[PDB]
């Protein structure tokens, strides 16, 4: 049956291609050409958080824009007060190889997972005042590459077995399992309304899911190598990706196709972390090289750099109020740029 | 408000005291990746030195992503068992990885009593400096040293002295001595003297 079933899908995928070529009538760069550029945007390291023995892998701002949780290969998860530089908690982990960390939108829990395939949920506001693991979501057969909280009960996790999964922390078993990727999924990002979430994997494909129905709405294939980072536009009707192709691309959920690419010939290092500013005008992208670029997300022209890490930038995140941009690196130091 | 910031700055003071009692135990232990439930840890101790060997058990056979985690590791223990050309092509990737370019690779070779997969073996004669242990023919010694010279073709073609391969034949004593040679050559390299 594969005689025809594999070749007609090439015609089926082909009639999808020209449908996207029928929508492309004016590139994003041409539309934004009239808009006056932002010039040079020079941020400087306000805070430099220290105390991590090993390279940081992920950080996540709290919704209050003050606290932030950083995960390191040392096996320590630390919550910092970006304002006073003080450390609030120093949660020690069982498995030292944690490749992700999340901060609940209520500030009550933090998650972290990695090469142990487990997603541990740590309860901060406990009755004894300390911090300990509440649940260990053990249902994945590969490493955990991303973790995002929807509520204090629903957490969607991206794993290295090509599957994302929606969980229920009060029970501990997967409410939904998202399948469709052909490579280990590297990052996800929840939508502003938390009804959908895009997800990038090592097959150069980004898939827009639906948390409720558990299906795959759209699939975006514009990159050429492993997509390492993904982030939703603050509007919720677009998202940006960063791959080992040394390029960033802005896809559109309503146009189903790529709108703009953010590449330069001087950069050959793959983007390792992508985030948007509060207005969605800047696209802060971390790189294999220590410097992190700042892209005018409308004009694709670079508008600044943050070359202070001195090591590969593992993570990157803008606050909800858009004040600071905490960047984490394998140098073991998390720098706040305003 | 000045008082709760004092209580906060005391919590940072109790934390930084624990982050210092952990920095000592972190620098004392030496990580080891054993290449070949998502990860298994073996904690052995040779001469009161804490070694932590981490076997990637439940991970898939696509390593291009989770292998980058083990770059700060002391040595990548690489056990070898066309299962041989697959290990030569894997070692060539562990060696020529930008992240693992500074990571030495201890290498073990299991062999018991080779021409169909490698034709140069009909033209390879064991070097005279090879010392065979008594108890087996000089033909497997010609085979044990051909594979060893196949991994050193990759170990020497690249690497300006940042990482070193340590091939062996098959315990924990050889990993202990090889880890000492890895750190000593790292200190000498920092002083720029070699």
């Amino acid at each position, epitope marked *: 049956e594969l005689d025809q079933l594999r070749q007609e899908a090439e015609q089926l995928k082909n009639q999808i291609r020209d449908a996207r070529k029928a929508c492309a009538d004016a590139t994003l760069s041409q539309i934004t050409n009239n808009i006056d550029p932002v010039g040079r945007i020079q941020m400087r390291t306000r805070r430099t958080l220290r105390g991590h023995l090993a390279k940081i892998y992920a950080m996540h701002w709290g919704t209050d824009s003050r606290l932030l949780v950083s995960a390191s290969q040392d096996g320590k998860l630390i919550i910092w007060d970006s304002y006073t530089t003080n450390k609030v908690h120093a949660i020690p982990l069982r498995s030292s190889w944690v490749m992700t960390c999340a901060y609940a939108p209520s500030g009550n829990y933090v998650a972290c997972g990695g090469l142990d395939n487990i997603c541990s949920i740590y309860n901060l506001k406990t009755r004894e005042g300390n911090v300990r693991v509440s649940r260990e979501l053990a249902g994945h057969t590969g490493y955990l590459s991303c973790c995002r909280f929807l509520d204090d009960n629903q957490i969607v996790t991206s794993s290295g077995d090509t599957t994302c999964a929606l969980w229920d922390i009060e029970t501990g078993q997967q409410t939904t399992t998202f399948t469709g990727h052909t490579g280990d999924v590297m990052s996800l990002s929840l939508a502003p309304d938390t009804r959908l979430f895009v997800s990038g994997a090592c097959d150069a494909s980004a898939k827009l899911w639906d948390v409720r129905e558990g299906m795959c709405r759209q699939t975006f294939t514009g990159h050429e190598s492993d997509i390492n980072a993904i982030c939703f536009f603050p509007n919720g009707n677009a998202f940006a990706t960063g791959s080992d192709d040394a390029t960033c691309r802005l896809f559109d959920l309503r146009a189903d196709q790529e709108l703009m690419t953010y590449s330069h010939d001087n950069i050959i290092c793959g983007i390792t972390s992508v985030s948007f500013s509060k207005s969605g005008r800047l696209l802060l992208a971390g790189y294999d090289d220590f410097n992190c670029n700042v892209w005018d997300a409308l004009k694709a022209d670079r508008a600044g750099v943050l070359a202070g890490h001195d090591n590969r930038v593992s993570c990157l995140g803008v606050t909800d109020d858009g004040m600071a941009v905490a960047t984490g690196s394998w140098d073991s130091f998390l720098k706040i740029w305003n | 408000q000045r008082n709760e910031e004092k209580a906060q700055r005391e919590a940072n003071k109790k934390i930084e005291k624990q982050l210092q009692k952990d920095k000592q135990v972190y620098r004392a232990t030496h990580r080891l990746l054993l290449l070949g439930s998502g990860i298994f840890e073996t904690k052995f101790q040779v001469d009161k030195v804490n070694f932590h060997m981490f076997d990637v058990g439940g991970q898939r056979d696509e390593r291009r992503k989770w292998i980058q985690c083990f770059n700060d590791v002391t040595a990548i223990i690489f056990v070898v068992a066309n299962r041989l050309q697959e290990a030569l*092509k894997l070692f060539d990737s562990i060696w020529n990885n930008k992240w693992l370019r500074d990571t030495s690779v201890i290498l073990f070779l299991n062999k018991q009593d080779i021409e169909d997969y490698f034709p140069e073996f009909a033209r390879y004669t064991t070097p005279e400096d090879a010392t065979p242990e008594p108890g087996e023919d000089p033909r497997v010694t010609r085979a044990k040293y051909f594979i060893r010279d196949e991994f050193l073709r990759i170990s020497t073609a690249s690497g300006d002295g940042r990482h070193y391969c340590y091939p062996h034949f098959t315990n924990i004593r050889r990993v202990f001595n090889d880890c000492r040679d890895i750190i000593q050559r790292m200190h000498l390299r920092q002083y720029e003297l070699l």
Partner: nanobody
Amino acid sequence: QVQLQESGGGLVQPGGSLRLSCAASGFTFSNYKMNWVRQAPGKGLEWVSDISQSGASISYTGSVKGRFTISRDNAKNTLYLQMNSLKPEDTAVYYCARCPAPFTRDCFDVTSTTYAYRGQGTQVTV
């Protein structure tokens, strides 16, 4: 969309000669180190050959040395494999793999068909 649609292959008598092509699209062909892997009937995938993005840096497996020859045309985005002196045990499905990241010297292309930047394969029966 990284599409590696190869051609060639079929049925040849033992001792014949084939020429496997590989029309690559969806990526800058001149930045990636291309490969050739095959899956023998009843066995896992094994690596056959490769070639660096420079154009002249070639490696083979021991059993195809002297008989096979890989060559790429960056100006046309095509990868070839001139097969000569076909042995009976050299029958397999030949995939036109690609190393994952550009401007690198390491590759992880034999990964139990779960590799994404690979072709569908061409049957070569001898």
